[PDB]
């Protein structure tokens, strides 16, 4: 969140994303030998419910960015100002 709130710092955000990807890969490797009522699955869901707020913020961040990608090319934003490259006064962007 702190890194997305500003620019000129994309590298740190990308490295943090790679670290989170490796962490969830570790979780998947822990789960890859589970049963429907596995003790490891119970431990993981307990860890999630303990870290409820953090994973909520991560999911909200991902929702925001995925919905932005879906909305920038959904109804009228791709042909709003089709003169040259992307020219948005950001006021129409906010209202849309």
Q: Which residues contact residue 71 at a Cβ distance below 8 angstroms, ignoring those fewer than 6 apart?
A: 77, 96
Resolution in angstroms, to 1 decimal, for this deposition? 3.5
Shortest CA distance to 1 belongs to which of 50, 58, 63? 58
Do residues 48 and 31 lie in contact, with contact meaning Cβ atoms separated by under 8 Å?
Answer: no
Distances (CA, A) of 31 to 53, 55, 67, 80, 92: 22, 18, 29, 46, 46
In this structure, the number of other CB atoms found within 10 A of the CB of residue 84 comes to 6
Q: Please provide the DSSP assignment of 7-49 as one string.
A: SS-HHHHHHHHHHHHHHHHHHHHHHTT--TT-HHHHHHHHHHH
- DSSP 8-class letter at 2: T
Q: At CA 66, angle to CA 16 and CA 89, rounded to 5?
A: 105
Q: CA torsion angle for 36, 40, 43, 45 (degrees, to 10)?
A: -40
Method: cryo-EM
């Amino acid at each position: 969140m702190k890194l997305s709130q500003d620019s000129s710092q994309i590298e740190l955000l990308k490295e943090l994303m790679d670290l989170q990807k490796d962490m969830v890969v570790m979780l998947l490797s822990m789960l890859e030998g589970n049963v429907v009522n596995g003790t490891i699955g119970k431990q993981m869901v307990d860890m999630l419910v303990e870290s409820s707020n953090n994973v909520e913020m991560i999911l909200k961040f991902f929702d925001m960015f995925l919905k932005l990608k879906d909305l920038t090319s959904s109804d009228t934003f791709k042909e709003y100002d089709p003169d040259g490259k992307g020219v948005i006064s950001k006021r129409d962007f906010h209202k849309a």
